[PDB]
Amino acid sequence: MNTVPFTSAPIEVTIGIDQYSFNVKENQPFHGIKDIPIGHVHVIHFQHADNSSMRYGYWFDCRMGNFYIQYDPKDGLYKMMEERDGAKFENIVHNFKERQMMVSYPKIDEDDTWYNLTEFVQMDKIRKIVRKDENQFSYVDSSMTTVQENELSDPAHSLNYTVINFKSREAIRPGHEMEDFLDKSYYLNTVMLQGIFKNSSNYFGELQFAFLNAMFFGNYGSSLQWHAMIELICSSATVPKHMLDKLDEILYYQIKTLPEQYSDILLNERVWNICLYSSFQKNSLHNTEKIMENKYPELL
Amino acid sequence: GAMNSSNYAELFNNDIKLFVDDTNVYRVTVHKTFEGNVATKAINGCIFTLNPKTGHLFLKIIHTSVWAGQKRLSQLAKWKTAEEVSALVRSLPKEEQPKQIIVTRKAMLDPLEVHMLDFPNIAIRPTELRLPFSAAMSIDKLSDVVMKATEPQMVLFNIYDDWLDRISSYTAFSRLTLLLRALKTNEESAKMILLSDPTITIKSYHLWPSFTDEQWITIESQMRDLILTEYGRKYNV
Ligand SMILES: CN(C)CCNC(=O)c1ccc(F)cc1
Ligand SMILES: CN(C)CCNC(=O)c1ccc(F)cc1
C-alpha cells in the first residue's frame, strides 16, 4: 500500500481519489492519502471551494515513483511532484502517518469497482495521450481539448485521443460506401483494432480512460471520445464474441458508477438508444441494457 | 446549411450548382399474387440532376436490372443515387464540377456526403423548399426515354428549351416550378392546358411547346388557376 503525502492544504478544496471524494478546509492539518492499492493506475483530482471552475487532477501509478502534492500559490493549484530522494520521502511519509494526518484509501474488500473501471488503463499508455514527457504522472482538466476538437488550440495541452470519424476516408473504403457506412466492421476490426490500436485491450483502455476523464473532470471531448468508441463497436455487424461480452461488463460498471444527477449531460440519448435498440449489437449488451433501463429509463 | 426562401437568388448566381432529386429512382407497381398476397414489380426510374442556372438536366436512367437480387431497395436507392451523382461529378472537367449540390430530400445527405468524400470543397445541402421535381416523369419525352430504356443510360436535356434567350434563369426556374407543380396536382388538366391549341407544337429538340411571350402568360395564368382550383377541390373552399 502506497502514499501520496501533501505538504499542506492552504486553500479549501474537495479532493477526489478514484471514485471517492472528501472535503478539506482552508489550512486544515491535512497531509495526504495512505493505503492506496498497488497494481492499479489512480487519479487524484481537485475542485476548489471558492472557484468551482476548473476541475483538474493527476493520473499516476505508485510503482513508477514517489509522488506528492504541494500547493503552488503563484499558479494557484495543487501540483503533483516527484520526490527522487527515497529516504527523504520515506521519512516524510512515516512522520505524517505517526501523527495520523493522512486519510486512508477507503477500499471495501468486496468491492472491485475501480479494477472494473480501469481494467486496461496503464500509466505509460496514458502518456501517449496527455503529452508531457518530463513527468511520470499526467495532468488533466475540465477544459483541455482533444486533437480532433482542435481540427474543428494549444497542442501541448491537448488530449491526443484516437481520431474516429464515420464520414471520413479512413472509415470508408472506395467502392464500399454504403457497405462500410451502414456496417463499420472494417473500420473497427481492420483500421482501428488491427491497425491503429493493435488489440482490443488498447481499444478498451482508451474508452475506459475517456469515460473517466468525462466523469471526474466533465471533459466534454473525452465524453465525445467515449461515445465515439461505443458507437463504433455497436454499429459493427462483425465483432468478436469476447469483445462484446467484455464491452457489456465495461459499460455496466460505468453506468453503475455514474452519479445519478450527472446523467443528463454525460449520456448521449441518440448513441444509447441506437446502441441498445437499433444497432447490430442491440441484443448483445444484456447487463448494460438492464442497468440502463432500471436506472435511467427517462433517457430512453 | 439549408436552402429556403430567404436565400433564393443564390440559385441563379455564378457558382455552379445542381439539385438532385431521387423521388423517381426506385419505382414500383404493387399487385396481387396468385395466392392472394401482394408483390411489387419495379419499373425503370431516373435520377433528376438539374443545374437551375443553365437548365442543363443530367437524366440518369435507372434500369430495373440494378435491383435484381438486392435487398432493402428504398435504402439502396439513395446510395445508388449518390454513387451515380458522384460518378457524374468525376466525369466532369474541374471547371464544370459543382460547388454545391442541393438534395431535395434530407435522406440523401449522408449517402451523398459519404460518396463525395474525395470532394471536400463541394457543399452538400438540404432545402426547405417543396420543389415539384417528382413530376418530371409527367414530361412525356422524359417519361418516354425512361420507359423504353433497356440498359443503364444517361440522357442530357435542357429543361428550359430555348427560354433563356428571352428571360432570365430566375424567371425560367419559376416557370418550370409552376408547370411541374401543376402537373403534380392534376396531370390530366395540366396536360390539357399545355396542348389544347394544336397550332402550338413541341419542337423535336424541345420538351415544352413553342409559346410566344404572350401565350406563356396565358399558360402561366391557367396553371395558377388550376393549382388554386385543385386546392379548392381538395379542401372545399
Ligand atoms: C463524501 N463521501 C461520500 C464520503 C467519503 N468521505 C470521506 O471523508 C473519505 C473518502 C475518501 C477518503 F480517502 C477519505 C475519506
Ligand atoms: C496506439 N495509440 C498510440 C493509442 C491507442 N490507445 C491506447 O493504447 C490507450 C490509451 C489509453 C489507455 F488507457 C490505454 C490505452
The full DSSP string for A142-169 is: TTPPBHHHHH---GGG-B-PPP--SSST
Classify A60 in phi/psi space as left (phi over 0), alpha (psi -120 to 50) or beta.
beta
In a domain, B205, yes or no: yes
Q: Are residues B121 and B221 in the same domain?
A: no
Same domain (yes/no): B157, B234:
no
Nearest chain B alpha carbon to A168: B117
- Residue A16 has phi, psi (to 5 degrees) of -115, 145
Cα-to-centroid distance, A22 and ligand 1 (Å): 4
Strand partners, B48: B21, B59
Give the largest Cα separation in chain B, rounded.
59
Residue tagged 488489440 (cell numbers)? A199
Other C-beta atoms within 10 Å of A17: how many? 20
Among B70, B73, B80, B117, the residue to mutate for chain A (most A Cβ within 10 A): B117
- The DSSP secondary structure of chain B, one letter per residue, reads --B-GGGGGGGGSSS-EEEEE-TTSSEEEEEE-TTS-EEEEEE-EEEEEE-TTT-EEEEEEE-GGGGTT-SSHHHHHHHHHHHHHHHHHHHS-GGGS-SEEEESSGGGHHHHHHHTTT-TTSEEE-BSS---GGGGGGSHHHHHHHHH--S-EEEEEETTTTGGGTS-HHHHHHHHHHHHHHHHH-HHHHHHHHHSSTTS---TT-SS----HHHHHHHHHHHHHHHHHHHHHHHT-
Interval between CA A293 and ligand 1 midpoint (Å): 29
> What is the β-pairing status of strands A42-48 and A56-60?
antiparallel
Handedness of CA A259, A260, A262, A263 (dihedral sign): positive
For ligand 1, atom 6, the nearest C-alpha belongs to A22
B153 and B170 together in one domain: no
CB distance B108 to B48 below 8 Å: no
Q: Per the domain annotation, does B3 fall within a domain?
A: no
| CA of residue B15 to ligand 2 center, whole Å | 45
From B119's Cα to the closest Cα of chain A, the distance in A is: 11
Q: DSSP letter at A298?
A: T
Q: CB–CB of B82 and A181 under 8 A?
A: no
Ligand 2 centre from A119 Cα, in Å?
Answer: 13
The amino acid sitting at A6 is: F
Contact A30, A16 (CB under 8 A): no
Q: Do B117 and A169 touch (CB under 8 A)?
A: yes
Measured distance CA(B164)–CA(B171) in Å, rounded: 9
User: How many beta-carbon pairs below 8 A join chains A and B?
Assistant: 21
Are residues B43 and B97 located together in one domain of the fold? yes
Q: Are residues B123 and B201 in the same domain?
A: no
Rounded to whole angstroms, the Cα distance separating B237 from B234 reads 8
Q: Which residues does ligand 2 sit against, CB inside 6 Å? A: A 120-122, 125-126, 128-129, 162, 196-197, 202, 205-206, 209
A176 min Cα distance to partner chain B (Å): 9
Q: Which residue of A has its CA nearest to B77?
A: A178
Q: Which three cell numbers stand for residue B194?
A: 399545355
Q: Whose CA is closest to A234, among A196, A268, A197, A262?
A: A268
CATH number, position B197? 1.20.80.40
- Cα four-point dihedral sign B27, B31, B33, B34: negative
How far is B150 from A141, CA to CA, in rounded Å?
64
Q: A104 alpha carbon to ligand 2 midpoint, in Å?
A: 30
Q: Which residues contact B73 (CB under 8 A, 6 or more apart)?
A: B26, B42, B67
Say if residue B22 is in the same domain as residue B115.
Answer: yes
Q: Is B69 left (phi over 0), alpha (psi -120 to 50) or beta?
A: left
> At which of B114, B131, B163 does a domain end?
B163
Residue A44 DSSP code: E
Phi first, then psi, for residue A143 (nearest 5°) are -105, 0
Answer with the one of B119, B143, B163 that is the final residue of a domain: B163
Residue A112: HSE in the Cβ half-sphere, 13 Å Cα cutoff: 6
Region of residue B140 (left: phi > 0; alpha: psi -120 to 50; beta: else): alpha
HSE-up (13 A, CA, CB side) for residue B163: 27
Place of cell 474508452: A207
- Annotate B136-160 with b (16+ C-beta within 10 A) or e (fewer): bbbbeebeebbeebeeebeeebbbb
A23 lines ligand 1 (CB under 6 A): no
Name A196's Cβ contacts closer than 8 Å, sequence gap at least 6: A162
In contact, B93 and B107? CB cutoff 8 Å:
no
Say whether both B101 and B139 belong to one domain.
Answer: yes
Q: Which is the CATH superfamily of the domain at A116-299?
A: Aar2, C-terminal domain-like (1.25.40.550)
Helix (H, G, I), strand (E, B) or coil at A138: strand
Comparing alpha-carbon positions, the chain A residue that sits nearest to B113 is A167
Residues B112 and B81 in one domain: yes
Ligand 2 atom having least distance to the Cα of A122? 13
- Bridge partners of A57, per DSSP, are A45, A140
**Which residues neighbour A16 within 8 Å (Cβ) at sequence distance 6 or greater?**
A43, A44, A45, A46, A47, A57, A216
Q: What are phi and psi of A68, to 5 degrees?
A: -135, 170
Burial track B196-216 (b if 16+ CB lie within 10 A, e otherwise)? eeeeeeeeeebbbbebeeeeb
Chain A residues lying within 8 Å of B83, measured CB to CB:
177
Query: Which of B163, B197, B228 finishes a domain?
Result: B163
Q: By C-alpha distance, which of A159, A136, A137, A129 is closest to A146?
A: A159
- The β-bridge relationship of strands B27-32 and B123-125 is unpaired
**Which residues touch A147 (CB under 8 Å, ≥6 apart)?**
A155, A158, A159, A160, A161, A163
State whether residue A273 is helix, strand or coil: helix
Query: Domain for residue B1, yes or no?
Result: no
Residues B194 and B125 in one domain: no
CB contacts, 8 Å: A169 with chain B: 117-118
Angle at A85 between CA A79 and CA A89, to 5 degrees: 65
Distances (CA, A) of A155 to A57, A158, A253, B58, B164: 19, 5, 32, 47, 54
Number of domains comprising chain B? 2
Domain with B209 in it: 164-237
B178 phi, psi to nearest 5 deg: -70, -40
Give, in degrees to the nearest 5, the angle at Cα A102 between A100 and A104.
110
Minimum Cα–Cα distance from A180: chain B residue: B114
Given ligand 1 and candidates A6, A21, A28, A35, which is best to mutate, with the most ligand atoms within 8 Å of its CB? A21
Q: Chain A residues with CB inside 8 Å of B79's CB? A: 177-178
Q: What is the DSSP string of A50-106?
A: S-----EEEEE-GGG--EEEEEETTTTEEEEEE---HHHHHHHHHHHHHTT--EEP-
A47: three-class secondary structure by DSSP = strand
Q: How was this structure determined?
A: X-ray
Angle at A258 between CA A205 and CA A286, to 5 degrees: 75
**φ, ψ of residue B47 in degrees (nearest 5):** -95, 140
Question: Which strand (E) or helix (H) includes residue A126?
Answer: helix A123-126
CB atoms under 10 Å from CB of A212, counted, come to 26
Instruction: Write out the H or E segment, with its range, that includes residue A231.
Output: helix A220-234
Distances (CA, A) of B192 to B197, B223, B226: 9, 11, 11
Pairwise CA distance, residues A108 & A110, whole Å: 6
Residue position matching grid coordinates 423504353: B148
If one counts every other C-beta atom within 10 angstroms of the C-beta of residue B98, the result is: 23
d(CA B237, CA B232): 5
Answer whether A148's CB lies under 8 Å from B95's CB.
Answer: no
DSSP B98-125: -SEEEESSGGGHHHHHHHTTT-TTSEEE
- B60 and B13 fall within a common domain: yes
DSSP-assigned beta bridge partners for residue A139: A58
